[PDB]
Amino acid sequence: GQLGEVMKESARIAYTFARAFLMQHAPANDYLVTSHIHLHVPEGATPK
């Protein structure tokens, strides 16, 4: 979805926090760390 690279670091950060929150909440699930995922953010937001 027309990522600017800054949006890419933000995305990776949010990803890692998701991965941590699951094991903090429901350890038995492992959906995030064991599967590929496409994610789409529609363009339009200004970079700042």
Binding site: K8, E9, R12, I13, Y15, T16, R19
Partner: protein, 49 residues
């Protein structure tokens, strides 16, 4: 002086700008989860900006 506690990885730096001089800060941060592979051996490439 924008930051006061200076959270890790930010440092002051003087700069002799085109008019006068100003105390611009320098900043850095991670860009990917670090332990992508505990055995991984790939250079931790920098990205200047």
């Amino acid at each position: 002086r924008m930051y006061d506690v200076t959270p890790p990885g930010v440092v002051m730096g003087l700069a002799w700008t085109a008019m006068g001089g100003s105390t611009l800060f320098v900043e850095t941060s991670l860009r990917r989860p670090q332990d992508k592979d505990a055995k991984g051996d790939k250079d931790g490439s920098l990205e200047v900006t």
